[PDB]
């Protein structure tokens, strides 16, 4: 969301994200199905599957996204460029 006032940028981004929703598949509704390793532009993300009780040990942003998705337990390591948008 972009605007001159900060309160107006929060609305645009918030109301526009519900129209671009994903659906994330979860293994037993607590973690991912398998280990993932990709590269978006220059940013490397290597996520790993973990059992129940492991918790979230990942970048603070990923911790905040995972709670929104519903992933309780997963490990992730970010390398390359730490850009919040990539």
């Amino acid at each position: 969301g972009k605007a001159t006032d900060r309160m107006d940028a929060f609305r645009k981004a918030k109301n526009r994200a519900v129209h671009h929703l994903h659906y994330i598949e979860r293994y037993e509704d607590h973690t991912i199905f398998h280990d993932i390793s990709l590269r978006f532009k220059r940013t490397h993300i290597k996520m790993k599957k973990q059992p129940k009780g492991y918790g979230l040990r990942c970048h603070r942003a990923i911790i905040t996204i995972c709670r929104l998705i519903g992933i309780k337990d997963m490990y992730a390591k970010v390398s390359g460029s730490i850009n919040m948008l990539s």
């Binding site: 519900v18 129209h19 671009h20 929703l21 994903h22 659906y23």
Partner: protein
């Protein structure tokens, strides 16, 4: 709500998942019809690429055995005064008539093109066809 991610998945996958998650309270009208009679290919967006190196398209040319005959007829004689009628599906051109006779004489047993080609022209001349050679 909804999902405007045209590149991610398809309208069916994106709608099937949101309905099952609870976001969409009512499934759209077309949904029940698509699940019953789905298309042959799932409409997923895929970016087109260029072919490099020795890669080539699998498309092949459509040739027939009678194309060798037509190429020679047009070279020896060429398209006659008679004009084609492409509208008429069951239309036979002067060249096509020459092919039918040329092939019919091949069934007899002649194994050479020169003699078989020459004999075919004579038959048409006997039938009244006009065959003016380029010369």
């Amino acid at each position: 709500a909804g999902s405007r991610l045209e590149t991610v998945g398809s309208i069916f996958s994106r709608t099937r998942d949101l309905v099952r998650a609870g976001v969409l309270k009512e499934k759209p009208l077309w949904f029940d019809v698509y699940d019953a009679f789905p298309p042959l290919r799932e409409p997923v967006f895929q970016r087109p690429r260029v072919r490099y190196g020795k890669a080539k398209a699998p498309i092949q040319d459509i040739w027939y055995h009678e194309d060798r005959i037509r190429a020679k007829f047009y070279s020896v004689y060429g398209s006659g005064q008679r004009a084609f009628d492409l509208f008429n599906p069951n239309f036979k051109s002067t060249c096509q008539r020459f092919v039918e006779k040329y092939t019919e004489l091949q069934k007899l047993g002649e194994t050479d093109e020169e003699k078989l080609f020459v004999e075919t022209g004579k038959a048409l001349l006997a039938e009244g066809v006009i065959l003016r050679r380029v010369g």
